[PDB]
Amino acid sequence: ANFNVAHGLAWSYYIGYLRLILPGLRARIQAYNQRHKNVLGGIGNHRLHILFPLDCGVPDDLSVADPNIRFLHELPQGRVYTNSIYELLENGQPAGVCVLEYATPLQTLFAMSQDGRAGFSREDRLEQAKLFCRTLEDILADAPEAQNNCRLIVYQEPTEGGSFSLSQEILRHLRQEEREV
Amino acid sequence: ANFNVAHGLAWSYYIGYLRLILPGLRARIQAYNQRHKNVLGGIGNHRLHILFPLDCGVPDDLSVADPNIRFLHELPQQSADRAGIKGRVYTNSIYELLENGQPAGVCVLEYATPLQTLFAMSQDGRAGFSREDRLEQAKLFCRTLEDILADAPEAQNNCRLIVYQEPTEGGSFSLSQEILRHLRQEER
Ligand SMILES: Nc1nc(=O)c2ncn([C@@H]3O[C@@H]4COP(=O)(O)O[C@H]5[C@@H](O)[C@H](n6cnc7c(N)ncnc76)O[C@@H]5COP(=O)(O)O[C@@H]3[C@@H]4O)c2[nH]1
């Protein structure tokens, strides 16, 4: 079989999702900030943060296993598209809040490498993950309204487990984006 | 610039949708029937019927596509935590197929999403992806997905692929008639 899938994953993810949700994301975050102004506190960073584990290990547990990343609130809105606001903690204390999620199509790359078909090893998976990343960034580089409204967080380590701190990785990105504004 | 997307679309649709939605479909249909069979009626056909128009953009709505296709009811939603989204929602719908002014069939029915992706790609204004390219990628997407499913016995027993051309110059074609022919061949 032909396992050159990265280009299809990138265009699927852009055309079928980022192109659809990124234009209205800032307004949904501002709507949330206004609804909950006197109560819940506000989200200053209006970008979508997309976690991109190159090992394609994408959890579905809302990061319950990582106590420094905690689901805070749904970002609300036929097909339904919703997003998630997460709290980041550092030294046990709150440290950040942002709209955050994983690049779901990495789970397709994971299943292909696990599904025990031949001709698609873990190294083949990593090469497809990188090409998926590069193609997506090339697509986003020519859609400046999309590039304005999302940031990819790419990393090599297991997303959960071991000494790598995903919360610190996300926090570092938030502070970088803070410098840009 | 590299618009060879069909292979990725097929694997993504299989892993990220069919493998996720098909195992729970029968229970959702059973729940629908227990709630509705005594008034609205029940659904005897428990398979997901997926439409693959090869040579025409995916209509945004089935009743628009064919006046002989009428929305009946949604199934209970499938909700699941997914890649950081809490309770991501997957919805599926039952349609009735009309013939000569009477309902003639009822089934869970939808379009294959990647064909909509391909259509949007050809309409986005970028150079190098014409209707000709779209048609070639649509056939390859269908072929690849069928190749994958021929290795997936459980899935292929729980969905049915309805693949068809459409005429563009007034040759007779009824989408409901095409679906009905498939439904009546499944009862064998
Ligand atoms: N009929 C149908 N109903 C659905 O709910 C659905 N969800 C996905 N799909 C299609 O199955 C395949 C796999 O989806 P995956 O989630 O792995 O990639 C998805 C996913 O990464 C992202 N995405 C789409 N919708 C959502 C969503 N509600 N929440 C988060 N991410 C989403 O954008 C990618 C492409 O989405 P679609 O372009 O709508 O087509 C998909 C795709 O062809 C669906 N098809």
Side-chain angles (χ1 to χ4, degrees):
Chain A
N2 195 329
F3 298 140
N4 295 285
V5 300
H7 281 94
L9 296 182
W11 282 102
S12 177
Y13 191 51
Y14 177 75
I15 294 289
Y17 183 61
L18 295 184
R19 200 200 54 180
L20 310 188
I21 68 146
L22 288 185
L25 176 75
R26 191 171 298 265
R28 291 165 56 214
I29 296 173
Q30 263 311 114
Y32 170 94
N33 287 339
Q34 279 281 354
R35 302 223 306 162
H36 300 124
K37 222 190 192 84
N38 289 99
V39 180
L40 205 38
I43 306 160
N45 189 318
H46 293 61
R47 299 178 184 92
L48 178 64
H49 300 83
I50 300 158
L51 296 171
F52 216 109
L54 290 175
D55 72 7
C56 300
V58 174
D60 296 316
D61 75 331
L62 301 187
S63 306
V64 166
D66 186 342
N68 287 328
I69 304 179
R70 303 182 190 194
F71 186 88
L72 204 174
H73 204 292
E74 173 190 86
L75 187 66
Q77 251 214 1
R79 289 200 49 194
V80 177
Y81 303 95
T82 60
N83 302 100
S84 305
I85 307 156
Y86 280 86
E87 183 167 37
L88 315 163
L89 300 86
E90 171 177 51
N91 324 305
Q93 276 174 79
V97 63
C98 68
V99 184
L100 176 73
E101 61 194 53
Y102 286 95
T104 315
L106 293 170
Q107 288 182 336
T108 293
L109 290 182
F110 181 81
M112 291 169 66
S113 71
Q114 298 300 110
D115 70 6
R117 271 125 167 158
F120 201 75
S121 67
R122 303 75 58 201
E123 279 296 319
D124 291 336
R125 186 190 69 207
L126 175 61
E127 183 44 62
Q128 287 292 295
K130 291 202 258 168
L131 178 59
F132 176 23
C133 197
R134 294 198 293 257
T135 305
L136 185 56
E137 298 169 310
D138 288 351
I139 290 171
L140 295 174
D142 294 317
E145 78 295 346
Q147 212 186 37
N148 214 296
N149 292 308
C150 76
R151 291 291 190 275
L152 280 295
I153 300 173
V154 184
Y155 52 94
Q156 299 178 59
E157 295 93 334
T159 205
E160 167 43 57
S163 56
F164 173 72
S165 168
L166 186 54
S167 54
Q168 284 309 112
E169 191 76 13
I170 299 162
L171 285 168
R172 192 183 82 240
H173 276 86
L174 294 181
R175 300 199 180 98
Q176 286 176 11
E177 302 160 21
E178 186 179 41
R179 253 167 246 110
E180 289 162 19
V181 306
Chain B
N2 186 328
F3 292 121
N4 264 244
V5 299
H7 284 112
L9 287 172
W11 277 103
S12 168
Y13 187 66
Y14 179 67
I15 296 299
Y17 184 64
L18 296 185
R19 288 279 73 211
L20 292 183
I21 202 74
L22 293 184
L25 185 69
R26 282 180 164 270
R28 290 165 62 211
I29 292 175
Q30 210 210 327
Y32 171 87
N33 288 334
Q34 191 180 102
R35 206 221 175 278
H36 293 290
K37 74 178 256 292
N38 289 311
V39 176
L40 186 50
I43 323 300
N45 196 314
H46 300 142
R47 299 185 170 93
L48 181 58
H49 295 83
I50 307 173
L51 300 177
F52 292 78
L54 297 167
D55 48 24
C56 290
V58 159
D60 54 316
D61 186 79
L62 273 168
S63 54
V64 183
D66 181 1
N68 287 320
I69 300 185
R70 186 192 279 148
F71 173 77
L72 183 63
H73 207 280
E74 259 179 44
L75 291 183
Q77 290 181 345
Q78 169 137 328
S79 169
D81 297 341
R82 299 276 300 120
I85 309 297
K86 177 162 192 149
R88 179 166 163 187
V89 172
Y90 301 85
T91 62
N92 306 88
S93 305
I94 302 164
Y95 290 79
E96 61 181 30
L97 300 317
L98 306 181
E99 198 180 64
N100 291 317
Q102 302 174 355
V106 176
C107 71
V108 184
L109 184 63
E110 57 191 49
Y111 284 106
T113 319
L115 293 168
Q116 199 283 319
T117 309
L118 289 174
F119 178 74
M121 293 180 66
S122 60
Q123 301 294 311
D124 68 3
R126 291 168 188 262
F129 203 74
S130 72
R131 185 171 184 272
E132 187 177 19
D133 306 309
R134 193 196 89 211
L135 260 59
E136 190 59 28
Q137 295 291 300
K139 319 291 165 293
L140 192 34
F141 159 72
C142 288
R143 185 180 316 176
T144 302
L145 182 60
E146 294 174 321
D147 284 352
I148 298 173
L149 282 171
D151 294 66
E154 57 290 347
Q156 224 188 0
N157 185 259
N158 210 211
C159 69
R160 284 298 187 269
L161 276 45
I162 299 171
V163 190
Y164 54 95
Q165 304 174 51
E166 291 215 10
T168 62
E169 310 183 353
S172 50
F173 174 81
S174 161
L175 179 58
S176 52
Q177 286 295 298
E178 191 76 12
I179 302 172
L180 285 169
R181 208 188 62 241
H182 279 261
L183 293 188
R184 289 155 173 162
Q185 296 170 354
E186 297 169 27
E187 190 132 53
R188 309 196 304 258

